[PDB]
Each structure stands twice: as C-alpha cells, then as structure tokens.
Design an enzyme around this catalytic site. Structure first.
Site, PDB file in Angstrom:
ATOM      1  N   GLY A 156      -7.749   3.973  -6.402  1.00  0.00           N
ATOM      2  CA  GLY A 156      -8.284   5.125  -5.696  1.00  0.00           C
ATOM      3  C   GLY A 156      -7.204   6.124  -5.336  1.00  0.00           C
ATOM      4  O   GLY A 156      -6.291   5.805  -4.572  1.00  0.00           O
ATOM      5  N   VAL A 157      -7.276   7.326  -5.911  1.00  0.00           N
ATOM      6  CA  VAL A 157      -6.360   8.413  -5.584  1.00  0.00           C
ATOM      7  C   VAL A 157      -7.177   9.694  -5.578  1.00  0.00           C
ATOM      8  O   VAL A 157      -7.724  10.080  -6.615  1.00  0.00           O
ATOM      9  CB  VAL A 157      -5.194   8.540  -6.580  1.00  0.00           C
ATOM     10  CG1 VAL A 157      -4.283   9.698  -6.187  1.00  0.00           C
ATOM     11  CG2 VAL A 157      -4.389   7.235  -6.661  1.00  0.00           C
ATOM     12  N   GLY A 158      -7.268  10.340  -4.423  1.00  0.00           N
ATOM     13  CA  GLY A 158      -8.023  11.564  -4.277  1.00  0.00           C
ATOM     14  C   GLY A 158      -9.361  11.558  -4.993  1.00  0.00           C
ATOM     15  O   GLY A 158      -9.626  12.408  -5.850  1.00  0.00           O
ATOM     16  N   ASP A 197       0.820  -1.208   0.000  1.00  0.00           N
ATOM     17  CA  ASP A 197       0.000   0.000   0.000  1.00  0.00           C
ATOM     18  C   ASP A 197       0.854   1.259   0.000  1.00  0.00           C
ATOM     19  O   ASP A 197       1.719   1.426   0.869  1.00  0.00           O
ATOM     20  CB  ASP A 197      -0.923   0.030   1.218  1.00  0.00           C
ATOM     21  CG  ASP A 197      -1.882   1.196   1.170  1.00  0.00           C
ATOM     22  OD1 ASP A 197      -2.519   1.374   0.109  1.00  0.00           O
ATOM     23  OD2 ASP A 197      -1.986   1.933   2.177  1.00  0.00           O
ATOM     24  N   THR A 198       0.580   2.159  -0.946  1.00  0.00           N
ATOM     25  CA  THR A 198       1.227   3.464  -0.957  1.00  0.00           C
ATOM     26  C   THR A 198       0.292   4.475  -1.613  1.00  0.00           C
ATOM     27  O   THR A 198      -0.589   4.118  -2.399  1.00  0.00           O
ATOM     28  CB  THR A 198       2.592   3.401  -1.664  1.00  0.00           C
ATOM     29  OG1 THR A 198       3.464   4.408  -1.134  1.00  0.00           O
ATOM     30  CG2 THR A 198       2.457   3.592  -3.164  1.00  0.00           C
ATOM     31  N   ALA A 199       0.479   5.749  -1.265  1.00  0.00           N
ATOM     32  CA  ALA A 199      -0.400   6.788  -1.796  1.00  0.00           C
ATOM     33  C   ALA A 199      -0.342   6.852  -3.323  1.00  0.00           C
ATOM     34  O   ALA A 199      -1.384   6.904  -3.991  1.00  0.00           O
ATOM     35  CB  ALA A 199      -0.045   8.147  -1.184  1.00  0.00           C
ATOM     36  N   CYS A 236     -11.511  16.812  -0.742  1.00  0.00           N
ATOM     37  CA  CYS A 236     -10.772  16.173   0.335  1.00  0.00           C
ATOM     38  C   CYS A 236      -9.290  16.550   0.258  1.00  0.00           C
ATOM     39  O   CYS A 236      -8.850  17.246  -0.656  1.00  0.00           O
ATOM     40  CB  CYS A 236     -10.994  14.663   0.300  1.00  0.00           C
ATOM     41  SG  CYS A 236     -12.707  14.191   0.672  1.00  0.00           S
TER      42      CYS A 236
END
Ligand SMILES: Nc1ncnc2c1ncn2[C@@H]1O[C@H](COP(=O)(O)OP(=O)(O)OP(=O)(O)O)[C@@H](O)[C@H]1O
Ligand SMILES: Nc1ncnc2c1ncn2[C@@H]1O[C@H](COP(=O)(O)OP(=O)(O)OP(=O)(O)O)[C@@H](O)[C@H]1O
Ligand SMILES: Nc1ncnc2c1ncn2[C@@H]1O[C@H](COP(=O)(O)OP(=O)(O)OP(=O)(O)O)[C@@H](O)[C@H]1O
Ligand SMILES: O=c1[nH]cnc2c1ncn2[C@@H]1O[C@H](COP(=O)(O)O)[C@@H](O)[C@H]1O
Ligand SMILES: O=c1[nH]cnc2c1ncn2[C@@H]1O[C@H](COP(=O)(O)O)[C@@H](O)[C@H]1O
Ligand SMILES: O=c1[nH]cnc2c1ncn2[C@@H]1O[C@H](COP(=O)(O)O)[C@@H](O)[C@H]1O
EC number: 1.7.1.7
Lengths: 461, 460, 460
Positions: free
Chosen positions: B295-297, B245-247, B302
């Site tokens: 899923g990214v922003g 998992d990473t941003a 947000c």
C-alpha cells in the site's frame, strides 16, 4: 524517457489527474540528497518559474522567488522604464536578507495594518533617516485608534545583527526573541533588511538563482505584436536574464517570424517561446531559434479557452509529447498551466519538462501584487486574472470594432493558506513534494527522475 | 486471479472499480466458512489493526485479539510501554472482557466521560478490587455532575464466577434490566464482564492466541536507528509478530533493516512494507520478510498522492504483489483505504492473506482518542497519521530537517450509533466476507482467492 | 435611595428598569474609590461567588479571594472535602498563583485539557517538586496527541524567588516570549507563578484575608437535618463566614435554623436567605442573622417564576430589604440575575453591601466544570442549579417525594475569547463600579448608596 505499466495505453490523452507514479527501487534516502537544479539554461536551482501575469509577477514576487532559486517572468507590455526599475530593485537585493515593509513614525496605524501583509515577516520596520527604530506587528495595531501614529505603538526593542552575519547565528539570536524578526544593519547602522528564523533555515536549503554577476535572476516576456526584435533588445539592455516570447497560439507564422527576429539579434540570452501542445509545434519553435518551448493550450476542459473554442490538450500528454520532441532536438520544455498541487509539479517533471510555470496558485500569497481580500467567512484571498489580449495577436470606430471580440479578463479567487500564506511556504510545499517523488522513484536529480519514472493510468474511481 | 473475458482495462484498479461475479456454490451457511489466515500471523479472521497511535491502543489490542484479529502496536512506543501493553493484553481473559471501572468516590462527571471507553453500556464500581455496583449513562442523567458515583450506582446486578459457560451467562441475563454480567474470581475480586452479545461472540469468533493460550499482539519498528536492537527488545517484550514499517519500503535502508532483524533469529514472523510492485515484493522477501505489507498512496486525493503523484490503485497493487509473494512462498497484507466490508472481501479475493485497517477503526469506543461530537451532536473521533514515524531520517540543524517533514493530517471518523464498538465493525466485516465466500462457492480464504471471478465496472 | 421627581411607577423594578443620574463629583480617579465592604464579610471588593457546585470550587475560591472577593462553598459538600478545600485555599500565596502542573510523562492530550483549568496560558512541568519547563497550547499543536510532555516542554523560562517585588517580576517578563514567571521557594521547588497582569493586579486588589493573613473562604448550609451541628463543623473546618441557604427563606424552619446556629456563638458573620420582603428581612435578622441574602425568582421567565408565579423584581427587592435591614443594623446581599457590571453597581446603589454572582462565573477557566465548545467552536461551560439542595425535605416513599422535586436546569455560559478568566470579569465589574462611584461623586460604597439619584426608563 517515461515508461508506462504494461497495458496502460488509454484511448485518450492524459491530465495530471489521470496518472500516478509507481515507486521504484531507491537508494536516495533523504529529501536533501536530491539535486533540484535545472539544466535548461534558465539558471533556476528549483524547477519553479512564476508566470508572466500582472496578477502574480511583481517586484516583491521576483525578489522573493529568485532568492529561493526560482525565476519570475515579468509580464509583457510592462513599460520599459518600469522593467528597468524592477530589474534594478531585484538585482540590488541581498542573497540572504529580505526586504521588509518599512514605516515612518508618522504613518497611521491604519496604513501600517494594511502594509504589513505585503511581506510574510509578520512585522514592519519603523525607520527614521534610514535607521531602524522599532517594529510594528499586527498585535501592536489591535485595540488602538486606527489613526494613532505608528510612533505610539512601535516596539523599540528588537533583535539586530550586521548584514553578512551567518544565518546560523541569526537563528540562534532569535530563539528567545518575542518577535521572530532580526533587523539586519549595514555598516553605518542603516537598515539592510530582515531575517526570520525560517528565512535563516531557508538560506541553508535553497540556493539563490543568480546571474553571472552574482545578482538575483529575473526574466521578461514579450508578445508577438509590434516590433518584437526592438522590444526584446530593450528588455535585454534593461537586464533581463531570459526572454519569453509569449502568445496564446504559438504554432503560427507570426510567432516563427518573431523568434527568428529575436534570435538574429544575438542578445546572448536563453529564448523561451510558446505556447504549443504538439511535437510539430515544438520542433518548429526550436528550429525558428528558441531553446525552450513553453507548453500549454487550454489544458483545463472547463476553463475559458476550451469552453470558447474547443481547443486545448490534456497537459500531461502535451508535456510528454513536446518534451520528447524537444529532447531529440537539443531543447527543453516548460510545463505552463494548471498547476495547483505539488503533484502537478512532480508529474510535469516526470513527463520530461525542465521547469514548471506557475501562475494563479501564486496569486494567493502575501507577495503577489494584488490587495489582500477577505471572503464571506473572513478567509483571506487574492484575485487572479488573465492576461487576455496581451497574449493575443492584434479610428475610434475601428478601436471598438476589433475590441468587440477580444477575450475578456476572467477573475478567480485564490485563497491564502492560513498556514502557507507566503510564496516561500508554497515553495517548501512544492519542493518537499518533488524531493519526495524523487526518493520514491530512485532519482538523485531531475534528469534521473525523467529517466527512471514508471507511470500508470487510473480510472475516475 | 480470474476476470470476466475482455475485462482488461488500460488502467489499474481501485476497490471501487471491481465486482465479484457469483459462482456455483455448495456453501450454504455463512458459518461453514473458515476465515482463519494462513500467513503465520495467527489471526482467525483476516483483520489486522494498523500500527497507528490513533487506533492501536491497549483497549483495541485486547478487544480485537479476543475476536481473532491482531493489533500492531505503533512504532516508537517506548519499550516500557510496550511491555506494559503486552502484559495487559496477555493477562486478559479469552471470553470475559475488561470493563470500565470506577471508585465510589469518583464524580458523576468523570463516570460519564469514562463510560465510552468500552462498548458495554455500564461501568463497574469496585472497592478493594471487588465489584459493588454498576453505573450506566442513564444513572448519570439529571444528577449534579459532582455527586459521587456511590450516590448513583446500582447495587443489584447479575454476577457469576469466571469460567461460567457463556451460554449459561447468556441465559442469566435474559430478563436482567442491564445487559451486563459481572464476572468474579474465587476471591471475590472483579474478573471482568460479559454481555449477551459478548457471550454470543464467544461462539462465533476464535481468539487469536500464542502457544501459551494468551491473546496475540504485534509491534512495529521503523527503519531509523538500530533496527536490530529495537526488534530484539520488542521480541523480548513478548510481541508475537514484528512489522518493519516505512513509507517507501522498496529502498536500500529497508532491505538492510530486514536483513539485520532476520540475522538475529528472533523466531517471529517478519512483516515488511510498504511496496506496491512485484519487484518490491520479491526484494523484501529475499531480504528476509515472510509477509509483505502492500500500500502506497492508494487514494487519488489523499496526502501522499497530492504531494508527490506517487501511489498505486490498491486492488491492482494487491493482485500483482500477492502473485509475486506466492511464487516465493510468502504472503501479502493489504494495507490502506479500507472503509467497507467490500474492501476486505476484495483484498482477499485479490490474494492478500490479511487486511490491515487503520482510520476506520478510529471511529470506535475502543480506540485511544477521546469521543467527540460534531455540529449535529453526532459522535466521532479523529484519526491522524503517523507522519514522520514512517519516514527515513544542533537546533538549527533540527529545524532545517524538520521544515520539509510531513505534517500530521487529521480526519473525522464518525461512530455508528449502532456499530459504535469495534466488535460491531468486526461483525459487519466478517458477516460480509462470509457472504462473499458463500456467493463464490468458497469454504475458506484460499478457496476464495482460487475460485473468485471478478469484473470491471464503469463510473456509472 | 432618591428617585427623580415623579418617578414612582405602579410596578416593581428590575435591573433593566433603572438608571443612575450623574452627580457633581470631586472623585477624579477610579482608583480613589474604596470598594471594601462594611458587612463583616471581609471582602475588599463587593463580589461574592454563589454557593453552587457549578461555580464554587477550590480554584475559584483561591482566585477570587486573592482579588478581594469571597467564595461560598456549596451546601452538602462533605466535611472532609470542606476541610481539604479550606486547607488548600488558606495555604495559597497572597500574590503568586497556583499553576497547572504536569509530569514529563503526561501525554500532550492530557496537557492540552489541563491547561484551561487556569488563565496563565502555560503549565509548569515538574520533576521532584522542581520546575523544569513550561507547556503552552502552541507547544501541543502539530504533535502526536500521545507524545509525552517531555518532548514538547520549553526548558527556558523566566524564574524569580517568591517575595520578589511584583514590579520587578513585571519588568523581568517584558521581553519574555511566555508571559509567565515561575516563582520558587528558597530551596528552588515550585512555589507558583506570576504573570505581568497578575503583577499589576497585586497593586490594584487587596486580598481578602482572615486574622492570620490567610485567604478567606465561606461555606453554606441548608436547613434540613441538624443545622447547628453542620454549622459547627464548618466553623471548625475554618470557614470565615456561614450562609444558611434555602429557596423560601421566610419560613419557620429557617427561623429555627438561624436561632440554632446563633445559639452556638461561633463568632462568624451569619448570612441567611433568601427573602424579598421587608418583613422577611426583619424576621431573619431578629432570628440571629447579621446579613440577609435577597433574591427569589428575579427573572420573569426563569424556572421558579414559570412554575409558581412567585418572585420579585430584584432592584425593588434589594431596595426594600436593604432599607429594612438598616433599621436593625444589618446588611443585605443581592443574590441572583447578575450578568453585567451595571447589575453589580445597581445592587450597591440600591443598598446591598455585597453582590452574589453565580452562573456568570461558570463561564470562566477557574470554574469546576469542563471547558466545552459549541456548534461554532466557541468556548462555553454549563451552569446548573442546586435544585433540591435549596429545598426543604421505603424506596417507594423516596420515589414518591422525588416525583415533584425540582429538576436541575442547565444553561450555557460562553467564555469571552479574551476575558476568559474570572479575574478578567473582576476587572470588568470593578472598573464599572468604580466608574459608577465617580459619576455619583462617591468615594466608597456607603457614599454610593447615600448620594445616588436614580430614575426609571420605559421599554423604549
Ligand atoms: N507602469 C506600469 N504600467 C503597467 N503595469 C505596471 C506598471 N508598473 C507596474 N505595473 C504592474 O503592476 C503590478 C505591480 O508591480 P510592482 O510590484 O512593480 O509595483 P509596486 O507599486 O512597486 O509594488 P508594491 O505593491 O510592492 O508597492 C505588476 O503586475 C506590474 O507588472
Ligand atoms: N509513553 C508513551 N509515549 C508515546 N505514546 C504512548 C506512550 N504510552 C502510550 N502511548 C500511546 O498512547 C495511545 C494510548 O495508549 P494506551 O491505550 O496503552 O494508554 P492508556 O492510557 O493506558 O489507555 P486508556 O485509553 O485505556 O486509558 C496509543 O497511541 C499508544 O501508542
Ligand atoms: N466529595 C464530594 N462530594 C460532592 N461534591 C464534591 C465533592 N468534592 C468536591 N465536590 C464538588 O465538585 C466540584 C469541584 O470541587 P473541587 O474544585 O474541590 O475539586 P477538584 O477535583 O480539586 O478540582 P480540579 O481538579 O478541577 O481543580 C465543586 O462543585 C465541589 O463542591
Ligand atoms: O487570459 C488568459 N487566458 C487564458 N490563458 C491565460 C491567460 N493569461 C494567462 N494564461 C495562461 O495561463 C498560464 C497560467 O496558468 P495557471 O498557473 O493555471 O493560472 C499562463 O502562464 C498563460 O500560459
Ligand atoms: O501519516 C501518514 N501518511 C500516509 N500514510 C500513512 C500515515 N500514517 C499511516 N499511514 C498508512 O495508512 C495506513 C492506514 O490506512 P487507512 O486504513 O486507510 O487509514 C497505515 O497502515 C499506513 O500504511
Ligand atoms: O436550582 C436552582 N433554582 C433556582 N435558583 C437557584 C438554583 N440554584 C441556585 N439558585 C439561586 O440562583 C443564584 C444564582 O443566580 P445567578 O447568578 O443568576 O446564576 C444562587 O445564588 C441561588 O440564590
């Protein structure tokens, strides 16, 4: 050059709210591997310019922002003697150590309490004969008679270090200090400034914006009325590092004439002119002699210019179009107006701007010239207000006649963040975000950001 | 995925932008739908609990796995805590739940605070491991808060041997004042509890279980440090699935991390994320992931989007990534922004094999945080982000790097006064998705993605 | 007491009805006043903490006794808990305080909650009896609430061996970032903490101690059951003073209980109450009480008065009972309704030897209840009554008697965002009473009552 996702060709123009950046394949792992320096001749090492507005662009702001790599544009019509005094102040500042609030032992606690919030240090330095003798904090002022003397609440014990000491060393000297402020001394022992732990860290993150003499950079604006050439030459002689020729409607003959007049004086300085929102306006300003075009006309649909006239353009589309035109002509574009979040800075840069001009957002900081105020909920804020007719083309009867239609000064409440009260906290916020945008895109610098970015359009969902 | 003719907008789509058109259906009953997933997670419903410290504790992992979901333990949970958590989850009964327990010498005040860690409405008083009484919230009211539990506990309660059929326990409870059956081991010790709703759910939800019949659980790992060593330890601790998992998943360090973990041949499904593009999906699969977390922003207002401008509307992101994964034989998890059963249904319609839910499930009894109450005495819990635990990484040097790091943002997630437990949310979610399938004519999740017709709506 | 000429109203007086007229004084300094009491309680300030579960816990008993007061343990505390509490209090240091302690493995969430059980602003992290760090509220902010204490603790802190002059510890802390000195035993293990204000207070307040130099503590008994046996066990557990406590003190069952305890010759001061009349005061003393506790329904709008009409305005009650007790060589405690330092001063002016304080002290860190926050996020705690534990006393028969029993009344006692500790309230109270004495011209409490001139005021 920007790329949009397939099919994202809306039948309308785009604000900063309309678009998003799609991540790309990246080998830029760390925020710190990104180079945020600009390439437009401004000399900024981060892409932040503070707007030529009296509500924002004072001497405390100009020192503080240029030390962290931005530049402040002094407002047009500041008297030339005040320009010279402001330039001389900024250019005598240390590149690492900051200027604190100072107090006399005979100041009142009440006056000390008010002055403390002119800087973000959380302490003022008591000086006698130029020598630091104590620190005053907000806590020292509580529960004492507001007309007691500073002498009676000041703390005589504080960390001190010679100016020029390594910021790394000052940081460690402060680790167990009760007050996170080091008093920096000149060789004779007089006060040279202050450095906090966070200021020490920022010295290792932000490169000061400096002129060719190694002194902090500063810019100055001129409107297009009167003798624009003579005004510009006086500003150059006063020491401005960059001139901004500024008017509400930049795409007009009087602006073209003003640019040619300033350019013909060969002052040796980068010339910014604006404001326009079209490729045609951008080209005409560059061909008149500007190297940087400032972009932004009524970008907010509910703001005063749009509600008075219908005139404006959504700012993302304006910047995309103008920056591409300027790029074809060897010039650059500043995105001016509407910036309220780090997203806006990142999108303006993705759109192709070389620099982003920020006004009212920075009014809500300790370092802006206005007084700190508190609303109904006792929340801190400062008032931003427009430059109004100082951006417009221009007997006692005749005075009131032309004055009847001119734009009023609109005022807005800009809340200070209880966690980001100083402008340098906003700069951390802004540049943390932009550095992150760069890592998501795969860009190691701002040219690569604009070269590689993929954008999409979103609905009102 | 099929849209109504002409519904080709010049923008990308959030969950709010789209609707499902009913189709001709022969699927009469919600219960004729098979909600099991096909991505190797082993879930029997399409729900995964996000690797977030605000959500993914031991009570959540037990409760959701028993109803067929799976919980991903948060990255950087110390390995001894991982082992203790896995051993707890994998020793739980498949039907009977773990109650709050109390000592006779506990205070009424402590009993009152502990009751809300589960959804049963009663704690079991135990002595030498055996049940001796029940404590309810009503038993705590009007009593000195420092009285002992022994002086408020009810000694009369329904009990039954563990292994008793849930239908029979259901009937044993029909006329009981307290809707809790206390289940005992052959030596008389407490085995757990079963309520009438718990007994009904045993007939609706299939537990998600490993090859030994024990509840499934997963664990996450970030891409800093020695990712292979960390993943190997998580595998040896008993995780059934690993989440890398990473941003920003579409980066070299993540590709390297997937390859390192994959080279260790740990024998577990490998999830990696997060991406929102077809290219990122292809690249993560080719590095070795079987499942790509998408899923990214996704939220326009947000933190990530407001800090960087970076992100992608989640329905469009899932559509593009699911199609890219499916060409390569892989799967996608829809991670982020789920607040209603509609979002779960839409993620699956878009082609996701599983839906990852975070902050919504923080507002439940079973999440790890304390139960709080707002100005109107309404219950809630705080969700908060994992922040730098999803990011790539002297005291001066540490403070230097720490300056720009993402702060931990917090949001209030209200508990439903009628859906206060996570199983009530699972009822809500799976009731809705089952109805989506009946409306589409789908008997299972592959048929839902195959048969669905979608439309776009305006901001009306 | 003397009243101004003509101030003979046709009603009885509350603490709100009266004022003290300044007299000619040669008591210049508040510190020249002797606040020690003369009733055999051993308190060095005239403060007694009420026998209420909402207030009278082990932290309160330690903290108040060190500053010269005494805490009365609530009646019906089990004798094993009495003994544990007495042993805790009598092993405390007379100067150095007991801190909140934490394990390196505790969570940040648990550290945050425990911090507020004392007023030091810091907890001491301990490993194998030795102090290794300090945790503050600031250390807990902005970190994952399930992070370990190990990751936020400060390893740098001021430390000094126990026995170091408080004045030296005070100086050692002058430039410390945390106003807490970690005090150590000779072997380096933790002995306690001392703050700069704790160092100052050691020079202002004389600890209330028994003949062996250990902190004093008292214990209450109700009049049901075997009162003599209960009193005997309390004395054997080490109580320095006994309180025989009931709602209606002027009754036969109370007279019998006093005689029973008196006949055991336990050698301890014996408080009995509550009454509000001269006759009740005389009867309790003749039965064997040395101190009479005075107070019955002193608030016109509180539960006792609104249920029964019974009570008496407290200033008149104290005046009458203290005069009656003095004719028999006895003493009176003013019990109830104290909310301001004025009330303590007026009780003493009326002739009380000591003032008993309940619900006001619930709103402190050191009281046993949990710290709460109201709609405006302001800190408070709940006080509540002892109810049937102050009253005379088949499951059918139990429910029959229980139907009329007094319910527990609950009230919110807000903490001062500054004077949150009980020692801050003691500073407030004793500063006030010392000032009253200087205004009256009194050097000690007997002189206060002998010299005071009082007047009556109207509702204006
Ligand atoms: N002579 C002037 N005429 C008009 N505007 C001026 C003049 N001098 C300064 N200003 C404006 O006043 C504001 C504050 O300027 P500046 O910060 O230089 O003042 P200062 O008094 O030195 O500041 P400080 O508040 O730190 O004492 C700016 O908007 C600046 O442009
Ligand atoms: N040693 C640890 N270090 C960091 N985080 C931890 C550690 N142990 C547990 N956690 C986190 O604390 C939260 C609660 O974990 P868990 O539910 O397993 O704890 P618990 O105290 O046993 O549970 P309960 O809430 O039922 O008392 C989760 O976010 C988990 O990841
Ligand atoms: N066994 C018991 N039965 C009834 N009441 C009790 C018992 N033990 C303690 N109490 C009551 O509980 C309250 C708190 O007591 P005490 O301060 O001794 O507890 P503690 O757990 O040591 O405190 P803390 O951990 O909060 O410092 C008091 O009202 C006390 O009389
Ligand atoms: O009075 C005014 N009316 C309209 N626009 C103004 C006025 N004063 C300044 N501006 C413009 O607004 C910019 C600042 O926008 P902001 O950052 O959104 O506050 C300036 O740089 C000018 O371009
Ligand atoms: O601190 C954070 N910032 C941004 N995204 C986060 C953070 N922590 C978790 N996330 C992401 O958000 C998801 C949960 O989204 P939610 O269900 O909308 O709360 C997680 O599974 C992560 O993908
Ligand atoms: O439940 C109760 N009802 C009425 N009075 C009580 C109760 N519990 C304690 N008290 C009395 O109230 C006193 C405390 O009064 P306070 O200081 O005004 O809270 C105690 O010392 C008892 O005399």
């Amino acid at each position: 050059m920007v790329r949009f996702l397939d099919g994202h060709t809306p039948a309308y123009d785009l604000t900063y709210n309309d678009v998003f950046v799609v991540p790309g394949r990246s080998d830029v792992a760390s925020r710190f591997d990104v180079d945020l320096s600009t390439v437009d001749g401004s000399g900024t090492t981060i892409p932040v310019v503070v707007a030529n507005m009296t509500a924002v662009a004072g001497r405390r702001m100009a020192e503080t922002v240029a030390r962290r790599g931005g530049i402040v544009v002094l407002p047009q019509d500041l008297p030339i003697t005040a320009v010279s005094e402001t330039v001389d102040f900024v250019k005598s500042r240390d590149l690492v150590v900051d200027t604190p609030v100072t107090l006399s032992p005979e100041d009142s606690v009440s006056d000390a309490n008010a002055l403390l919030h002119k800087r973000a240090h959380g302490a003022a330095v008591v000086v006698f004969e130029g020598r630091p003798i104590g620190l005053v904090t907000e806590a020292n002022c509580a529960g004492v008679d507001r007309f007691a003397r500073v002498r009676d609440i000041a703390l005589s014990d504080f960390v001190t270090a010679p100016v020029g000491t390594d910021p790394r060393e000052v940081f460690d000297l402060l680790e167990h200090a009760p007050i996170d402020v080091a008093v920096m001394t000149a060789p004779d022992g007089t006060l040279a400034g202050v450095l906090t732990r966070t200021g020490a860290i920022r010295a290792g993150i932000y490169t000061p914006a400096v002129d060719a003499k190694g002194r902090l950079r500063i810019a100055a604006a001129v409107g297009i009325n009167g003798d624009v050439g003579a005004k510009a030459q006086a500003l150059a002689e006063a020491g401005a590092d960059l001139l901004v020729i500024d008017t509400a409607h930049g795409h007009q003959a009087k602006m073209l004439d003003a640019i040619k007049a300033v350019a013909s004086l060969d002052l040796g300085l980068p010339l910014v002119a604006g404001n326009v929102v079209s490729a045609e306006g951008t080209r005409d300003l560059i061909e008149a002699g500007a190297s940087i075009v400032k972009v932004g006309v009524g970008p907010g649909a509910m703001c005063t210019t749009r509600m008075m006239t219908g005139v404006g353009r959504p700012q993302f589309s304006a910047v995309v179009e103008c920056a591409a035109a300027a790029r074809q002509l060897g010039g650059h574009v500043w995105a001016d107006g509407g910036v309220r979040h780090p997203r806006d800075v990142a999108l303006a840069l993705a759109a192709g701007a070389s620099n982003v001009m920020i006004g009212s957002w920075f009014a809500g900081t300790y370092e802006s010239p206005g007084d700190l105020l508190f609303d109904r909920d006792d929340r801190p804020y400062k008032e931003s207000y427009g430059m109004a007719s100082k951006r417009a083309v221009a007997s006692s009867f005749d005075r009131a006649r032309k004055g009847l239609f001119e734009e009023g000064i609109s005022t807005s409440r800009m809340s200070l963040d209880p966690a980001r009260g100083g402008v340098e906290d906003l700069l951390d916020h802004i540049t943390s975000g932009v550095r992150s945008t760069c890592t998501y895109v795969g860009a190691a610098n701002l040219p690569e950001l604009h070269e590689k970015v993929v954008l999409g359009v979103q609905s009102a969902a």
